[PDB]
Write a protein that binds this ligand. Structure first.
Ligand SMILES: [Cl-]
Ligand SMILES: [Cl-]
Ligand SMILES: [Cl-]
Ligand SMILES: [Cl-]
Ligand SMILES: [Cl-]
Ligand SMILES: [Cl-]
Ligand SMILES: [K+]
Ligand SMILES: [Mg+2]
Ligand SMILES: [Mg+2]
Ligand SMILES: [Mg+2]
Ligand SMILES: [Mg+2]
Ligand SMILES: [Mg+2]
Ligand SMILES: [Mg+2]
Ligand SMILES: [Mg+2]
Ligand SMILES: [Mg+2]
Ligand SMILES: [Mg+2]
Ligand SMILES: [Mg+2]
Ligand SMILES: [Mg+2]
Ligand SMILES: [Mg+2]
Ligand SMILES: [Mg+2]
Ligand SMILES: [Mg+2]
Ligand SMILES: [Mg+2]
Ligand SMILES: [Mg+2]
Ligand SMILES: [Mg+2]
Ligand SMILES: [Mg+2]
Ligand SMILES: [Mg+2]
Ligand SMILES: [Mg+2]
Ligand SMILES: [Mg+2]
Ligand SMILES: [Mg+2]
Ligand SMILES: [Mg+2]
Ligand SMILES: [Mg+2]
Ligand SMILES: [Mg+2]
Ligand SMILES: [Mg+2]
Ligand SMILES: [Mg+2]
Ligand SMILES: [Mg+2]
Ligand SMILES: [Mg+2]
Ligand code: NA
Ligand code: NA
Ligand code: NA
Ligand code: NA
Ligand code: NA
Ligand code: NA
Ligand code: NA
Ligand code: NA
Ligand code: NA
Ligand code: NA
Ligand code: NA
Ligand code: NA
Ligand code: NA
Ligand code: NA
Ligand code: NA
Ligand code: NA
Ligand code: NA
Ligand code: NA
Ligand code: NA
Ligand code: NA
Ligand code: NA
Ligand code: NA
Ligand code: NA
Ligand code: NA
Lengths: 186, 154, 95, 156, 92
RNA sequence: UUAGGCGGCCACAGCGGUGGGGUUGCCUCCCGUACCCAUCCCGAACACGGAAGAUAAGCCCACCAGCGUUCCGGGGAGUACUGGAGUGCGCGAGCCUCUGGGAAACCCGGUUCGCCGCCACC
RNA sequence: GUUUGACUGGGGCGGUACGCGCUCGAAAAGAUAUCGAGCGCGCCCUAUGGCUAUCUCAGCCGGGGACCCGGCGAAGAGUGCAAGAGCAAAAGAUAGCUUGACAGUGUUCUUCCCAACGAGGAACGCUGACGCGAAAGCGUGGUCUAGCGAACCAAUUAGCCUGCUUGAUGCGGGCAAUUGAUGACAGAAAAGCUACCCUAGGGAUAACAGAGUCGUCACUCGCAAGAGCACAUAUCGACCGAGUGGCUUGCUACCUCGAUGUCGGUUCCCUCCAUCCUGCCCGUGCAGAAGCGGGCAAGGGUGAGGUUGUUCGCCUAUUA
RNA sequence: UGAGGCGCCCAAAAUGAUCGGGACUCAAAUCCACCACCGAGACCUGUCCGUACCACUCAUACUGGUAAUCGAGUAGAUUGG
RNA sequence: ACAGCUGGUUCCAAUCGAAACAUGUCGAAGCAUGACCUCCGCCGAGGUAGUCUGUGAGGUAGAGCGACCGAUUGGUCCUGUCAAACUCCAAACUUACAGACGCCGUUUGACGCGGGGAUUCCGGUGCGCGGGGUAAGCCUGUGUACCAGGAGGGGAACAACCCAGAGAUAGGUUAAGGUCCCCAAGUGUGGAUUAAGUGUAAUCCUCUGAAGGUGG
């Protein structure tokens, strides 16, 4: 920018999207990466492999196409993340993928976070992934209990119209239950 | 195809330059060989440029020299029309000459020594301390230029 | 040379042009080679590890197995046969 | 000491003051002479051209310059002309002043390297070439044979 | 330099990490009954005594660390490579 | 790819600037702290929960060359330098011819305001 | 009785280019010398090691050279110490935790390019045990290249082997390894004089002569500032520049060490010219006389004495 | 007034001057071209010798064949006499 | 007596044919180990002194510095300069590997493996590139060819400059160099310059001739 000697960062470093020091370490395993990413409204999970001209995604799941299986609730929460992980994990298995390492990008390794919920889901789908059980949420929160109880302190529906007034961690079970047998695209 | 004649001796010449002439089958002064005009051969002649005389000879000249100084791979046998006919694919010296010039074959392929052992130039050459453009005898020659040299060394 | 360490006279060969400065891309540090493949040796100024003695910069050897994540490349120094332990970060496929 | 000792450019360039100390100051008094307030807005421009690469000690530069400018006072102390010596003595020179043992010399001076055909001096004059004479005197005190060249001046 | 008196590290006997205690090797006293001692007495006579007429070498500017690492549970010590240190003081 | 995610090459992609775009696939900003989590002090950030509002930032789309960069034409320049050769020149420094290569600065005019891969998606 | 080292533009004195690292020399692969240029290492550090979390620095600007806020800011900060190199969601800073600065054993490169050679060093593994991290992973000390030491002997560490017919005890001998120094650093335990000297050799190497060089020395030329009451050039003549000689001095180490007899003097012969006198001339700040300066010119001449071995030089009276 | 070619001044050394010498001037000098010659053990060519290799052979005895790609050599290694 | 020091060591021929360097050494007038020379046995199909092309390595020459760095002018942006230990640039060239052609090897066995025997570790010169030095027939590197150990032809003579690498003998033609005589071959041809005997002198310790000047 300033001159011939000026050093311009790699594009994905400029965009503040890729941590290359963490990426290298991730690629050391020689295993596919379970890419856990979030959005204000959604949660994405991809199983990416290395390629000659860039990464290759062999399987993925988005919290949006969760409804495609009976999801009638918001998609930017814990129960959402888990299911998206399980969904991607199952598709992963179908694709012949057996193991992966969790890549949480620029997110933080906070215990009980959504990226770890995604990791929990993928593991239950059958994917073998290096993990640590006591850094994951305590199931109930994954189910969405923390939000149901939060609505107990109601007075006004936590959900604007949406579905239910007291919410449903039960809707969570019905869905997980669903994903664990048959159905299309899995 | 160019005619190569060593005009300068081995004493004091670079070794890598000497080995080049040797890979072109010339091991003595006044020895001549015929070389196809290829990239590989071109570089070799450029490296040897300062101790040799080279250029494309005329059909006639080649025939005179072939008849006069060509030899079998082994032996004294004169390489005349009959020899050429009874030993090669061609029917006479002219036919062989043309094939060489059109780079369709080689002296070896036709059972002939790759070297034409020439005679010193009758009347003397133009000197081995300067190139043609300076009046000397070294370097690339005219077809008329090569012919004169080759004929004087017939 | 006034000294005889490994980095003697390596000022140029182990220095990056100002623009190639900074952490190198991970892609080539994870590249995988097969036994028999021809690889060019060239230290990447930005990568500390998996290096080899600077004298061999420019060599082109034959991968013949590996040790840990590093590769074992066979070269010929002058007339002598040598084996070099080197990582992908400093190797490139020939051709 | 004779110029014979330093006029040739056969030695490596030796100008890095970060590794060389005790360098004698230069004897060259000025590089811009005459009306330096004005810019080359003159009709005629003559140049003294060196005809052989050589080293010119700051000694010779000063004497050459003085002999030329001191003479350009055929025009007056505040005359209308500007004189320029474009070279600077960057090359540090030594002398081995023990015999050939530990002979790396000690710094004794400086010289300017001029390649054949460069102009060492450039004067700017109105049709009043007294400068041509100032230079006959200048190339008199520098080693090489020289060419007195006139550029803007078809007023012959 | 400084060095902790106790610290966790590998015990080659126990074959597992444990707290070790570090101590400078105190010189052991000679008995004067080794073979070399008998050779000195035997071979010393009239005139020069060859090797036994030599005297104490000298000193290197800095000596290497001379320590004992004692396992805190099995009580067995082990030795390690030393490193040059002008001074070595223990912490606690 | 009517806006996404992971990337490869790592400025042809940088710097700066103009215009356009969203009841929704969307991304954001945004709203908000019972929870998981969090600030050596701050729900700023990180984390979690969520849509009342917005397209003003970001982002995506279209474009501008003033600076930086890449490549190209013409000029500089077959100049500077140089591998091989010479009973060529020069007091010498050094130069010249033949042969095989061949630049940098700079000027003028074009190019460049990224290209490509995998996945997902009215 | 012995030792008292080597290197070295002879040797000695001085120095260490005697073990190591960096830039340059080094001729764009690698290798490369000199008493080559610039300059370092013989340690320091329990954190200044290791990992993780959080974070981004110099410098400048604007608002209240400490501190606080914002902005610009690819790196000029910092990273123990030479030099060069590496590094920015870090290899730097802050915080916390930890002891991988771990035991064992290897592969490979280096040391020693090519191409054999030890100690030492490094890179990269494995086996075992650990630290931290969600995890991939990182940790075989410090971002990389200096910080190092044989055999014999001793001390030390853990287990085991072994000592002469045999048992017990004592005290020995050994396998693996750590520490103790040899810096002349691939390791002797070590001061000088010789003119009273001796031998082997060397022109592999100095003194003298020769030879090469010419910085030094001698002489000349170009330019001509300047002064010379005015006037560069009657005369003197700086600076700078270009040369000639081979008388001095220095350098080099080609020639001679199975010897080319030293300095000074003397005697006797030949020569050179850059001419002191003499001949013939030019200029003059040439009235004359006496000079000053210059040109041609080597035929002839250039002498006697006082001090000093002196060469040189000082001094006296004569002299064209 | 610009450029070029050759020459001139600058230009002093020791037993007898020199371009090897004599001597040379529209050259026997110099530069641009050109013509014809002389001149090695090189190159071409006849015969022979050695060495290596090939065919035949018990043979390293004969005989025939190949060498453009064999023929110099201090120290030294090897081998026949 | 011992010496790492000087001297000497006696018949013929054929094949190959060095090293004057690197590491260690009380080592530098010596050794050992490598390099290099040679001999023997083994292996069995490739090898690579040259060139071309492809895939790589590189910061010397040059150049430049409103690209770092550090030097280095002046004026009220402009203007004057540089670098062995500077680099936004950047050759020629050297170099790793591979393919192609060439050459070479498979009865002349290459490439390579194992073993026996050395000699050698004072080198020198030219050219190119160097570093030191006023310079040197100087010192000390480097690449190459030569002398050493290389005849014969030329250069007046003359280790390394030119031609040229050489079995014997014979005929012939050239090379470098030369053709007025000495001295083999031209008092050759077309044209021009020079009046100084310039000159009749490639290279060189060796052949000088400079700055400056010239209405020759
Ligand atoms: Cl994300
Ligand atoms: Cl290595
Ligand atoms: Cl201790
Ligand atoms: Cl015989
Ligand atoms: Cl030969
Ligand atoms: Cl005469
Ligand atoms: K003597
Ligand atoms: Mg034949
Ligand atoms: Mg003839
Ligand atoms: Mg001729
Ligand atoms: Mg005693
Ligand atoms: Mg907008
Ligand atoms: Mg004795
Ligand atoms: Mg004594
Ligand atoms: Mg000595
Ligand atoms: Mg190199
Ligand atoms: Mg490290
Ligand atoms: Mg001892
Ligand atoms: Mg001890
Ligand atoms: Mg030693
Ligand atoms: Mg050593
Ligand atoms: Mg004696
Ligand atoms: Mg001598
Ligand atoms: Mg005598
Ligand atoms: Mg006279
Ligand atoms: Mg006389
Ligand atoms: Mg022979
Ligand atoms: Mg014999
Ligand atoms: Mg014989
Ligand atoms: Mg370099
Ligand atoms: Mg340069
Ligand atoms: Mg090179
Ligand atoms: Mg000899
Ligand atoms: Mg005659
Ligand atoms: Mg003459
Ligand atoms: Mg000459
Ligand atoms: Na990089
Ligand atoms: Na001295
Ligand atoms: Na001059
Ligand atoms: Na006894
Ligand atoms: Na605090
Ligand atoms: Na927007
Ligand atoms: Na000693
Ligand atoms: Na070792
Ligand atoms: Na002298
Ligand atoms: Na002189
Ligand atoms: Na004698
Ligand atoms: Na005398
Ligand atoms: Na006289
Ligand atoms: Na006297
Ligand atoms: Na012999
Ligand atoms: Na002795
Ligand atoms: Na030697
Ligand atoms: Na030695
Ligand atoms: Na000796
Ligand atoms: Na081939
Ligand atoms: Na040059
Ligand atoms: Na030879
Ligand atoms: Na001769
Ligand atoms: Na004459």
């Amino acid at each position: 920018a300033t001159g011939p000697r000026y050093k311009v960062p790699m594009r994905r470093r400029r965009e503040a999207r890729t941590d290359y020091h963490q990426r290298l370490r991730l690629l050391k395993s020689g295993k596919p990466r379970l890419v856990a990413r979030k959005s204000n409204k959604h949660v994405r999970a991809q199983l990416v492999t290395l390629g000659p001209n860039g990464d290759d995604t062999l399987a993925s799941a988005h919290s949006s196409d969760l409804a495609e299986y009976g999801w009638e609730a918001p998609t930017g929460n814990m129960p959402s993340a888990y299911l998206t992980g399980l969904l991607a994990g199952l598709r992963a298995q179908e694709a012949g993928v057996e193991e992966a390492v969790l890549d949480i990008g620029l997110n933080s390794p906070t215990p009980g976070s959504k990226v770890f919920a995604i990791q929990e889901g993928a593991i239950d789908a059958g994917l073998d992934i290096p993990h640590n059980d006591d850094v994951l949420a305590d199931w109930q929160r994954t189910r969405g209990a923390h939000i149901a109880e939060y609505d107990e302190q109601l007075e006004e529906p936590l959900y604007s119209g949406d579905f239910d007034a007291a919410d449903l961690p039960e809707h969570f079970d019905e869905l997980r239950e669903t994903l664990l047998d048959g159905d299309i695209e899995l | 195809m160019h005619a190569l004649v060593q005009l300068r001796g081995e004493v004091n010449m670079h070794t890598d330059i000497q080995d080049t002439l040797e890979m072109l089958n010339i091991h003595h002064v006044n020895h001549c060989t015929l070389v196809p005009e290829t990239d590989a051969y071109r570089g070799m002649v450029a490296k040897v440029n300062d101790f040799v005389a080279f250029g494309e000879p005329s059909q006639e000249t080649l025939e005179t020299v072939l008849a006069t100084r060509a030899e079998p791979l082994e032996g004294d046998a004169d390489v005349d029309d009959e020899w050429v006919a009874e030993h090669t694919d061609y029917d006479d010296i002219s036919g062989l000459a043309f094939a060489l010039l059109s780079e369709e074959t080689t002296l070896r392929e036709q059972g002939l020594s790759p070297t034409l052992r020439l005679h010193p130039p009758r009347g003397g050459h133009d000197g081995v301390k300067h190139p043609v453009k300076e009046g000397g005898q070294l370097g690339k020659h005219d077809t008329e230029g090569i012919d004169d040299l080759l004929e004087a060394m017939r | 040379p006034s000294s005889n360490g490994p980095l003697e006279g390596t000022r140029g060969k182990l220095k990056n042009k100002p623009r190639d400065r900074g952490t190198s891309p991970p892609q080539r540090a994870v590249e995988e080679f097969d036994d028999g493949e021809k690889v060019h040796l060239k230290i990447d100024p930005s990568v500390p590890n998996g290096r080899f003695h600077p004298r061999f910069d420019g060599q082109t050897g034959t991968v013949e197995g590996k040790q840990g994540d590093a590769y074992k490349v066979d070269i010929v120094d002058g007339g002598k046969e040598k084996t070099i332990i080197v990582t992908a970060a400093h190797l490139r496929r020939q051709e | 000491k004779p110029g014979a000792m330093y006029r040739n450019s056969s030695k490596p360039a030796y100008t890095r003051r970060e590794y060389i100390s005790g360098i004698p100051g230069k004897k060259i008094a000025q590089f811009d002479m005459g009306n330096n307030g004005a810019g080359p807005t003159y009709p005629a421009q003559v140049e003294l051209v060196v005809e052989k690469p050589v080293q010119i000690r700051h000694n010779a530069l000063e004497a050459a310059r003085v002999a030329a400018n001191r003479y350009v006072q055929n025009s007056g102390a505040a005359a209308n002309y500007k004189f320029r010596i474009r070279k600077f003595p960057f090359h540090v020179i030594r002398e081995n002043k023990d015999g050939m043992r530990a002979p790396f010399g000690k710094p004794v001076g400086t010289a300017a390297r001029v390649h054949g055909a460069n102009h060492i001096f450039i004067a700017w004059v109105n049709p009043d070439p007294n400068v041509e004479e100032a230079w006959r005197r200048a190339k008199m005190k520098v080693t090489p044979t020289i060419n007195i060249d006139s550029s803007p001046a078809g007023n012959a | 330099m400084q060095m902790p008196r106790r610290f966790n590290t590998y015990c080659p006997h126990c074959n597992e990490h444990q707290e070790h205690e570090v101590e400078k090797v105190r010189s052991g006293r000679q008995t004067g009954m080794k073979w070399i001692d008998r050779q000195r007495e035997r071979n010393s006579g009239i005139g020069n005594d060859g090797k036994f007429s030599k005297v104490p070498g000298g000193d290197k500017p800095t000596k290497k660390t001379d320590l004992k690492y004692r396992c805190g549970e099995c009580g067995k010590a082990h030795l390690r490579e030393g490193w040059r240190a002008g001074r070595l003081e223990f912490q606690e």
